[PDB]
Write a protein that binds this ligand. Sequence first.
Ligand code: CLA
Ligand SMILES: CC(=CC=C/C(C)=C/C=C/C=C(C)/C=C/C=C(C)/C=C/C1=C(C)CCCC1(C)C)/C=C/C1=C(C)CCCC1(C)C
Ligand SMILES: CC(=CC=C/C(C)=C/C=C/C=C(C)/C=C/C=C(C)/C=C/C1=C(C)CCCC1(C)C)/C=C/C1=C(C)CCCC1(C)C
Ligand SMILES: CC(=CC=C/C(C)=C/C=C/C=C(C)\C=C\C=C(C)\C=C\C1=C(C)CCCC1(C)C)/C=C/C1=C(C)CCCC1(C)C
Ligand SMILES: CCCCCCCCCCCCO[C@H]1O[C@H](CO)[C@@H](O[C@H]2O[C@H](CO)[C@@H](O)[C@H](O)[C@H]2O)[C@H](O)[C@H]1O
Ligand SMILES: CCCCCCCCCCCCO[C@H]1O[C@H](CO)[C@@H](O[C@H]2O[C@H](CO)[C@@H](O)[C@H](O)[C@H]2O)[C@H](O)[C@H]1O
Ligand SMILES: CC1=C(C/C=C(\C)CCC[C@H](C)CCC[C@@H](C)CCCC(C)C)C(=O)c2ccccc2C1=O
Ligand SMILES: OC[C@H]1O[C@](CO)(O[C@H]2O[C@H](CO)[C@@H](O)[C@H](O)[C@H]2O)[C@@H](O)[C@@H]1O
Lengths: 85, 176, 730, 160, 42
Amino acid sequence: GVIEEYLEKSKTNKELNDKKRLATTGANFARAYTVEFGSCKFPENFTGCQDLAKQKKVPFLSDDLDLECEGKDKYKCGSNVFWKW
Amino acid sequence: SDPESLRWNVQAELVHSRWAMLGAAGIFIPEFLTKLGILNTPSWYTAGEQEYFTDTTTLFIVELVFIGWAEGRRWADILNPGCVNTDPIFPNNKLTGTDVGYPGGLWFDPLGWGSASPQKLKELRTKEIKNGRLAMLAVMGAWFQHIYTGTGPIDNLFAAHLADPHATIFAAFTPK
Amino acid sequence: LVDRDPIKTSFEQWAKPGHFSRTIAKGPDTTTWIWNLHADAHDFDSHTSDLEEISRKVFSAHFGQLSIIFLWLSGMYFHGARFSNYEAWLNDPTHIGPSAQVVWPIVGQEILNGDVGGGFRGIQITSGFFQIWRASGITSELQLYCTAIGALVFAGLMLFAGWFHYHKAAPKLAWFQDVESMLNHHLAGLLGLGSLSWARHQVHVSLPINQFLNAGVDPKEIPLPHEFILNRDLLAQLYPSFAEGATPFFTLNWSKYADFLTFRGGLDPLTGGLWLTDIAHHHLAIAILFLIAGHMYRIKDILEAHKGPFTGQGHKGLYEILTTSWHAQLSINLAMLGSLTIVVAQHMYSMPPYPYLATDYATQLSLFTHHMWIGGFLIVGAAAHAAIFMVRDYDPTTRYNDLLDRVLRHRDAIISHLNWVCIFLGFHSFGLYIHNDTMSALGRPQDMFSDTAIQLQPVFAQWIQNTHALAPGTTAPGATASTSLTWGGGDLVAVGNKVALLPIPLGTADFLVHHIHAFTIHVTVLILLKGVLFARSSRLIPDKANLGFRFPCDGPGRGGTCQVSAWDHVFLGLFWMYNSISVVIFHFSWKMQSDVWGTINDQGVVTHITAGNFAQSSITINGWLRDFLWAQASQVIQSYGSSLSAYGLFFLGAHFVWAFSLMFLFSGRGYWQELIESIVWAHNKLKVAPATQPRALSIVQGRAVGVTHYLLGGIATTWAFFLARIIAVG
Amino acid sequence: SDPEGTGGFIEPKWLAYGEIINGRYAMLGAVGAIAPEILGKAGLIPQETALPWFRTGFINYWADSYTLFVFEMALMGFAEHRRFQDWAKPGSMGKQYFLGLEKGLGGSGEPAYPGGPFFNPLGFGKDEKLKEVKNGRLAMLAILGYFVQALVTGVGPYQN
Amino acid sequence: MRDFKTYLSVAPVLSTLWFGSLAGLLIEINRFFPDALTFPFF
Ligand code: CLA
Ligand SMILES: CC(=CC=C/C(C)=C/C=C/C=C(C)/C=C/C=C(C)/C=C/C1=C(C)CCCC1(C)C)/C=C/C1=C(C)CCCC1(C)C
Ligand SMILES: CC(=CC=C/C(C)=C/C=C/C=C(C)/C=C/C=C(C)/C=C/C1=C(C)CCCC1(C)C)/C=C/C1=C(C)CCCC1(C)C
Ligand SMILES: CC(=CC=C/C(C)=C/C=C/C=C(C)\C=C\C=C(C)\C=C\C1=C(C)CCCC1(C)C)/C=C/C1=C(C)CCCC1(C)C
Ligand SMILES: CCCCCCCCCCCCO[C@H]1O[C@H](CO)[C@@H](O[C@H]2O[C@H](CO)[C@@H](O)[C@H](O)[C@H]2O)[C@H](O)[C@H]1O
Ligand SMILES: CCCCCCCCCCCCO[C@H]1O[C@H](CO)[C@@H](O[C@H]2O[C@H](CO)[C@@H](O)[C@H](O)[C@H]2O)[C@H](O)[C@H]1O
Ligand SMILES: CC1=C(C/C=C(\C)CCC[C@H](C)CCC[C@@H](C)CCCC(C)C)C(=O)c2ccccc2C1=O
Ligand SMILES: OC[C@H]1O[C@](CO)(O[C@H]2O[C@H](CO)[C@@H](O)[C@H](O)[C@H]2O)[C@@H](O)[C@@H]1O
């Protein structure tokens, strides 16, 4: 090679760079830097309203983890009254 | 049931070692030394920026006229006089052997106590870090690998490519 | 030996002249023992007088074959991968003309590398990967690049099982010297659990991933790397997820189906490689058997049983020593393994099992002659090693008065017949042709043996071919066509690039080749039969098991007393078989192209590589170089400056190497001695020779360097002659 | 000298007895049930390119991700073969510290169980009223084994 | 470790690391000069 000024005037720089908000990643799921969402509380279908829905709700989904466990329902089989149709 | 398996020079491999390795000294501390931001900068204008190049392959010649000279003198009188024929003392010679070198010729010898004994004590020092240097440099010669492979963008050769996150090379540390 | 035996040295034997019989390689110098050492390197009359080990070596130095077949295949999967053409060829078959190998343009090289398909320079193929490879319920170049290292995996490991024998302190006797179960296992679950396992990865994945290939796409516009799990939803197109059946049995209803299989027979219009909708069913229907079958049993019992009057009292006892032989239970095997390879060579060409074969002419006849030389090179062997039995293997004579002691009883007898068999053939089996010449060159056709002069009349037909293509109306269920499209009855429409198979007609010029084969197959066998039979004793020499099964020749006396032995019966029996196979090949392609291979266009006016020239004109045995050798081969001797060229450019060497064999075959021995000294003299004057007493070839080595050359000569000659008349028109 | 590896009817079984013992608490999922609320599933290849299992589990995961997965199982496997060498024995492990007489303080000894010894002698009132401690936890291991693929799917529990 | 008046041994075919190679370096002169049939000199 051969140098004239100055390996640099202004040194190495913005090539790693992150600084004020070193953000991307830690952040993005800056939906959820705080997966904060809803109510508190409580009644029902939360998951707003964006998100949605509740799709089939109670213990389900939510699980997620809805919460909680309820004198239900209680999933197990038979019912839902397989309401289809 | 265990190899058979070798040596004998088992005695000599060990002295290009102290060659290879001590040696890597030269690269190990001067690099990192370098001198981060000395103040700074690396600029070499002097014999070098205007006299039509300086070296490369007059480089080597001068460069290892010396290494020339000295690397030879190195193993080929390390020691070994007697220096010819003709029945076995093994190393593949010691055809120096029972005679060191001379029957009452000159001062072949260093040092009193009819031998060459650089005295008894000093296992210390160089058993340790030094056949270290052998070991050490295995892994910061395994850094040579890490330190640069990946041919900083400026070239993908035989395009697999084959996936893609982000870059790599050297300066110290790591993302992690 | 003697050296340190003991107990008292791990210190290995590197250094101190010799080893291998006992006034051994002697201190005193010589050369013969350097062909010794390699020859007979494997053998057993030395190593130790005691079984034990040997089976402990052969189960190891076996191993390193699998491992090898395994380093091999890898460089072929790798090769059939990144040296690509497979990706390119598959979206684009009927079109391509495949490669895997390519030079590097050093020196002359490059001419060898000549545009092969999906747009690149290379050297072609007649080794039908790219066609097992149809398989790939997946496709992808780097993928084969896993199948590939998957190969090197099995290897290193299925090669450290060979460390993990002999060198490791070994099993022993019982382990094999209890045989009691062996085939129980083998045939049941591998024979079975492969064909079985192969089923599962032969409709799961492959069938579907060429069920909708036989149309278009460009791969990954199809068959993902996982896609074929639980998802039994694409398995929806290619039959039910059993819908309401549960684990076959019957309380099943079909108002409209019958699982995959729905048996075919014939040939895909668009990929005539025979149907796959079958290929599962047949492998399934195998394994079962093996699955049931490998469940005998424990031995004697069954052979210790059925005897008779003239039959085999010794049948009963047919060898304790069939747990104590090898050389015996190898030779038996070779006859089968070997004879069970060239049965491939038919069911292949008259029933292709891979997509794109037939159309692919040259990429399945190579096959049908490679497979063809093993179903022969392994059979003369299958005799040699019996000779190796018949002479020695057992300790003493404990084996007695049986099926054998029987056969031998007659022996100037079983071979007394067989002989006349051959001269009856030969006279009915070759001079037959020579009639033609002598009388067609005399010229009076009235009276030849033509497919038309001697009484036979425009039909062959009424035999059994015509009750094969027509049998789907017996106990036969059916399924459009036959079993093998080459049979008499019905159907035509086979393929839309070139052709494939159709009837294949007969009579004479099919009648008599078919007979030369007889006489050729027969006199081959005469010489091996009488060879192995008269192994140890005779009324030319009875003192004749006294060294080994080789030995040069007993000695100038008795008249001749030279060839005898049975290394040598397995030396002049190779000599024939090289014909046996070398003329059967000559048969197939001259047929398969004179008729069959040829080609469709409008009104499918068929146009064979040759308008049946065969007709009236193989019957003449000149026609066999008028129509063959001088006709085709014109592609070998035109082949310079091309791409294949390496064939024409072999076809001179190897058509040289053969014509170097005769020198090894045809000559004395104290000759090249008498010569080797004149040499040795001139040597000494400058002071340049004696040390390692230079010596001529070991009478029978000499024969070893006949034969072996005569074949690797006389053979690759056609290996060239061939690939050069199917690449390029045909 | 060269390292050792004695085969003999049934090492393969002592270390094969052991392999499953470790896998009986590497059974994990129901031994420590708080371990997976949903962690038994690894969660391969579900890129922000694409997808998981397939219809899955879908109402795999948030995650505890990453790389530095080989370095662990290797580096702490670079310990499994040390409590396998060190205590070949000649003891000096407690290198203590050059000076300082005040280091009576011990800790345990060689431990198997409630520690140095068993300890605090004095016991029994209430708690009250060699391979079975092995046997039953492959009867916990191989059980999740089929429970990964534990489905009939097209149909389901015939039983029921 | 090897001084004066012959040395250590070697195998049966180290000729197969002498046909292959040495000789092999020679294609290596038969592409540097990718051609012959007379030759310039030095
Ligand atoms: C299952 C099969 C197989 C096995 C395991 C064996 C095993 C054995 N055979 Mg055998 N054999 C077989 C099939 C087999 N054979 C077949 C098919 C034949 C018919 C040809 C024979 C004919 C035969 C004879 C006549 C003899 C044996 C002998 C032996 C024993 C000697 C082995 C030895 O030193 O290697 C021998 C191999 C060499 C020395 C290597 C030379 C190979 C040359 C000829 C190269 C071949 C050409 C090829 C194109 C060259 C490579 C390419 C080149 C151009 C670059 C050994 C127990 C010998 C014995 O005395 O019994 C104890 C006896 O010589 N066999
Ligand atoms: C282990 C296994 C398996 C398998 C499977 C298998 C085990 C399979 C196999 C198969 C085999 C095969 C399939 C074969 C093949 C062969 C080949 C392919 C060859 C060919 C050839 C010829 C023809 C001749 C010579 C040459 C060659 C080589 C080319 C499994 C096992 C098991 C167990 C216990 C557990 C559970 C599960 C199971 C599963 C039950
Ligand atoms: C796709 C990716 C990734 C990654 C990352 C990665 C990912 C990296 C890697 C690395 C690698 C390494 C470090 C190594 C590896 C290796 C492997 C993976 C292998 C595997 C295997 C198999 C598969 C089988 C056989 C065995 C083996 C091992 C071969 C990405 C994605 C994304 C998206 C969505 C968008 C944009 C952003 C991001 C976020 C970017
Ligand atoms: C003259 C020559 C050669 C020739 C040659 C010839 C003139 C011929 C040859 C031939 C060879 C061969 C021939 C081998 C081989 C092979 C192969 C590889 C085969 C294969 C195969 C198989 C696989 C089986 C059967 C069939 C076939 C054959 C195809 C040379 C000469 C020389 C001189 C001057 C001096 C120095 C040395 C040299 C350089 C050497
Ligand atoms: C074993 C340790 C936890 C429970 C053991 C002791 C009894 C359990 C406490 C019951 C509390 C009152 O009744 C309770 O009984 C069971 C045990 O908690 C719960 O079982 C719970 O466990 C599941 C874990 O995913 C959750 O989906 C539900 O909340 C529920 O299934 C009942 O759904 C709950 O309603
Ligand atoms: C080669 C020596 C002749 C001796 C054998 C001849 C006997 C049978 C007659 C011809 C045999 C070849 O069979 C061939 O017949 C026709 C050529 O006329 C072709 O006829 C084909 O082309 C047309 C396109 O729809 C239609 O007439 C037919 O539907 C179709 O089958 C066929 O591609 C093939 O079935
Ligand atoms: C020609 C012929 C010879 C003479 C053939 C000989 C002497 C061939 C052996 C020549 C050897 C192979 C040359 C080996 C020399 C080289 C290996 C040494 C140099 C090493 C290389 C680097 C060149 C016989 O000895 C013979 C014996 C019995 C029946 C027929 C014949 C027969 O026909
Ligand atoms: O302190 C550990 C850390 O992990 C905890 C335990 O503290 O538990 C889960 O979370 C981590 C991630 O930190 C998981 O990898 C771990 O294996 C889980 O059990 C969590 O509470 C802490 O963050």
